[PDB]
Amino acid sequence: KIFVAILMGSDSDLSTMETAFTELKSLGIPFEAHILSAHRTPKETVEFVENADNRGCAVFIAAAGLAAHLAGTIAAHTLKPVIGVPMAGGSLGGLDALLSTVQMPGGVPVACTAIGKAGAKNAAILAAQIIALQDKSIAQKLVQQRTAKRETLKKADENLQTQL
Amino acid sequence: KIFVAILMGSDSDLSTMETAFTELKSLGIPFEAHILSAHRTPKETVEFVENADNRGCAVFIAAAGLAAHLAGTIAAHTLKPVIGVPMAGGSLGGLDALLSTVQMPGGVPVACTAIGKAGAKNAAILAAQIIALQDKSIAQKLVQQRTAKRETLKKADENLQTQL
Amino acid sequence: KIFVAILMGSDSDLSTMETAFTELKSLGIPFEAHILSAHRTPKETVEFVENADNRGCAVFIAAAGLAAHLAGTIAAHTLKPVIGVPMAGGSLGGLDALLSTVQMPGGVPVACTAIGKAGAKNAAILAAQIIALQDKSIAQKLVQQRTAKRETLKKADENLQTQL
Amino acid sequence: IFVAILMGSDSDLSTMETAFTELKSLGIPFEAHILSAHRTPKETVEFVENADNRGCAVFIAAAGLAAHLAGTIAAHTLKPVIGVPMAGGSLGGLDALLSTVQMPGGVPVACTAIGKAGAKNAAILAAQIIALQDKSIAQKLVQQRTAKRETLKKADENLQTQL
Amino acid sequence: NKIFVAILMGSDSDLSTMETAFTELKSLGIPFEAHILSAHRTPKETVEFVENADNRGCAVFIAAAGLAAHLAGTIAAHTLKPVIGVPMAGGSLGGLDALLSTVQMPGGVPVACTAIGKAGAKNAAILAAQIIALQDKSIAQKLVQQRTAKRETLKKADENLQTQL
Amino acid sequence: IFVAILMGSDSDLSTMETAFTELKSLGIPFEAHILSAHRTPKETVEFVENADNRGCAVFIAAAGLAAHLAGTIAAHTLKPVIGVPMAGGSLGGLDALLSTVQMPGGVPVACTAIGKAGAKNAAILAAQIIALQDKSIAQKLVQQRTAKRETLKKADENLQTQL
Amino acid sequence: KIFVAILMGSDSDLSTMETAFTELKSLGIPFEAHILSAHRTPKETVEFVENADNRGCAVFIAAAGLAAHLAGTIAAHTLKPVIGVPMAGGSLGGLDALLSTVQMPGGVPVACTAIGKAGAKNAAILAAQIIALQDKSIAQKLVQQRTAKRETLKKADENLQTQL
Amino acid sequence: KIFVAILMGSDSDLSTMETAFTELKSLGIPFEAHILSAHRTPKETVEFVENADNRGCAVFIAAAGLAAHLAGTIAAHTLKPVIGVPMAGGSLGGLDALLSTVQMPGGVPVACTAIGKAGAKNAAILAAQIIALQDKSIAQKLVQQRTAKRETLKKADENLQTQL
């Protein structure tokens, strides 16, 4: 009954946001994903946010590049947590997207993650952490993911030792 | 029955945008000005834009700082030209507001001007230049405004010679 | 039972973070606040975070400037949501703080807000939004808070009309 | 009524072709020239003053690095001037952007986005300005946005099939 | 037709900074002209003066501008005399825009850019002197003793530093 | 006596091999581990405190993006800590450089250049510190500089021919 | 006769380097300080470096603003560790000084610290940490110094508690 | 015997400075080029600069990337005009090289050109404009170069007209 909603401004963002899809799947957390633009389809974007909110959406994830307005538009229309992911495309290396996502005025928060794929994964994990506050099974899965990454780094470290 | 509409997100933007008021008055161009936030009063912002557009608004001017989403929001709900002025408040000196204003994705333009007072003034004049395409009295006034400023500069240059 | 934990590396951060204290009180959300440095008192910081987590802390908020490592250190030791507020001090306008806070590698997310006082206010509101997923009383207070700020801006707008 | 497009180098043609396409698709007539503010200052000014008098409604200028072209145009006309920052060089076109937008009060340039996004938006902005007195172009501007929304709807529909 | 330096600035607010140049020139004995001339507000007048000064014997042009600094670029576009550009520091970006807008000239039309602000103003004046000193022996000797003098200054300040240790 | 090199990820090995090579060539012993400040905080701290007690003279840390590794090391030791910012990411390692060098007064981290030059310099700087107590190493540092001077003098003579 | 040599290019840097003199005083490390410019007094700058190197200088500390070249010039003439402190004066907040100091090419290292007073204090402590490798009496002071700052922070946290 | 001296830190910089050799050759201006590092071969660099100065070098050109100190070291040892060219190599796009080259303290000027190839050509041209003050031959060559490039752009504009 709980789910995450992922919106992206362009279908070219799908390359980066697959990381998020993968992450949510791996945790057993249902999500919906749509191509919705604050600039080109403002009415539909707003409609979906209000409908998703009403249908039980726990967290929104928004991905946009350049002058990224998507996250702020969502935040303005719901009081559910909103996570903003700055895309890396364009000549400024996503710096425009980052500043445009994170510098919100007092009153209307957006949670901003790292630029690019790292941010897409972190968006998914953050949503999971928020959800785990009420879902102990998700909380358990988060613990074991960190345990498995540590085993992974240990292996990498043991391999390094042979090469020196 | 042709006018310029100026929106700002914050009462504190008035310090800068008064420069714009003074400009349009001195060109005898009528305008409406409102405090409307893309983030705090989104529905009201949208209603006004659609309502002003229908009543003969020729050009929209929008001022905002930090993550400036106002001009982008306006541009998305109208095909009248939208001019964006980045505010200078904040520790990044308005670099965030500039990048967030000008970096619009192809298909939905915003005309961005300089940061702060320079931009406010330039926004008013850009608007006048646009209206001048159809109002010859306006064009006449813009020409004499440029002549008057040349005299002023020569005045200052003559003054400098005595100081040497 | 549920509370927010605010940490800051320095007492100079209090000027900014009072804004967060104020928002949380207004929403009736219990919080704890401490001076704890990731650099100067790492052991105490880690002991606090782990214990606070165990005691029912739902959200950690961290304030740091310059090379801001505090949020990174908290997130490394808890699976509870962690929000980082970049401080605006130093000759770089807090840009170092922002990049150091937001650019976390995939796997250990930190929710970054705006720089300075706007970010402190938003940290508090985002924390409230997260807690409001499981608390109707808080959900309702966030609604009325946004309603009240809309009324305040409407008033400011009507006020402006007479000043034109 | 026409739009005049200037660029200071034909390396700028890659980008500015996007603008040509937009104007063509909207049926808006244009002239385009290679004219440098740095290399051909007199010819640049001559053209501007000549184009202006023949009914140029909007100037579009494309320049990179230290982009001075738009500013040079705006100094010599009261027609709207749109500046498009080229993305080339090692600074991601940030130099060009600041060079274009940071005009002093009195002589405005309308700055668009860096690169092709900016080339497309300059064409569309010039069209929005001209549409203030042209039903035909206003109507074309509407249907263009309508078509784009259809494009995004289909993209969304395709995504759902894969989810 | 005497050798002088021409100083242009787009605004009377640039003067507080460019005074430093006047002083440096005044002290090396290099004659100069100075004018408020704007590439944006008075383009015709700016070009007219540049071509006029060039042919009248101007050896070096110094131009000061802030924000989107187009003045040095404009001058260089109309003369083959060396153009020195000094970016002004005002505005919210700390003169970064002025700097990039001054230095990033395409190949073929050079502008010698100096430091932002008063440091730049002084160095422009000294640089103009160094250019002039290839043909003028007295200037060259004045420039040398200038360096002898400051090495003194610093050497003094150094011994002061030792008294406070 | 030895140098300890830590890095958050295997992908940093690209750059840090450069450090290994310089140390080998100077005959300075070192240990290297993959240890993350974010992913394995306990093990990172446990290792620093251990190496510290077994006579580690200098720590070298490599991290990209939001680099907290060097800072975590310096917080737990009073041995000299050197930070090397990686160039990876869309920001050119600017995030990494500011995140490494801008430490609070009291807990220093010696920052070197971004990328492979910084990796080389971390190794040489460690060697310079150790050479304060070990003359064989000092002599080696001097001979290395003499050699590169030869290389450069050689390259100059070749250029004289290309001219 | 282990001592630390501090160089600065202008007396205007004394505002800043006082911090380091003190740190070095507290820890009882002998030092020398000079006004010596890489640009203005290059011959004297080189004489002093080689001389002091030969007299047993263990570490050089150099401070410079804007285009900071002093540290690079010192490193070119000795094999002793050289620490660079970037000054924060100027409209670019010492960003020019930072890049100018830290971006040394492979082969000739400079240990760069933070901008301004933070860096100045850190340079002293880093000098101390290098020297302590061969003087446990300094090593001992450095440890007690951290203990003291921790007590300072604890007291500051205690004061915070009373006001909450 | 008026000549121009070009110094460069690394042979990796030849790629870029060829452009300068070519410009100078085409103008018939005699030049010398040397690999000389301010960091790796300081004594020899200084030896060359003072030697060439006394031999009648009129202008120095210096090329360097990263923390570019070469131009500044030459300037410290001569009163001849020194022209600095920032190399584009490295992850910072040559911004580190630019700031390190142009931000000279008042008293010791360096004339900085643009980053990379453009800068290399402009250094040669600037050197020629300086020399042209005392050599009408070079002056006239400069004039015809400018006339020739206009013909090129004209030809390119005519090509453009065929494509429309």
UniProtKB/TrEMBL annotation, chains D, F:
It comes from the Bacteria. One of its GO terms (molecular function) is lyase activity. It catalyses: 5-carboxyamino-1-(5-phospho-D-ribosyl)imidazole + H(+) = 5-amino-1-(5-phospho-D-ribosyl)imidazole-4-carboxylate. Belongs to the AIR carboxylase family. Class I subfamily. This is N5-carboxyaminoimidazole ribonucleotide mutase. Substrate binds at S9, D12, R39. Pfam families: AIRC. Catalyzes the conversion of N5-carboxyaminoimidazole ribonucleotide (N5-CAIR) to 4-carboxy-5-aminoimidazole ribonucleotide (CAIR). Its EC number is 5.4.99.18. It comes from Coxiella burnetii (strain RSA 493 / Nine Mile phase I). It is an enzyme of class 5 (isomerase). Keywords: Isomerase, Lyase, Purine biosynthesis. One of its GO terms (biological process) is 'de novo' IMP biosynthetic process. Pathway: Purine metabolism; IMP biosynthesis via de novo pathway; 5-amino-1-(5-phospho-D-ribosyl)imidazole-4-carboxylate from 5-amino-1-(5-phospho-D-ribosyl)imidazole (N5-CAIR route): step 2/2. The gene is purE. One of its GO terms (cellular component) is cytosol. Residues 1-152 form the PurE domain.
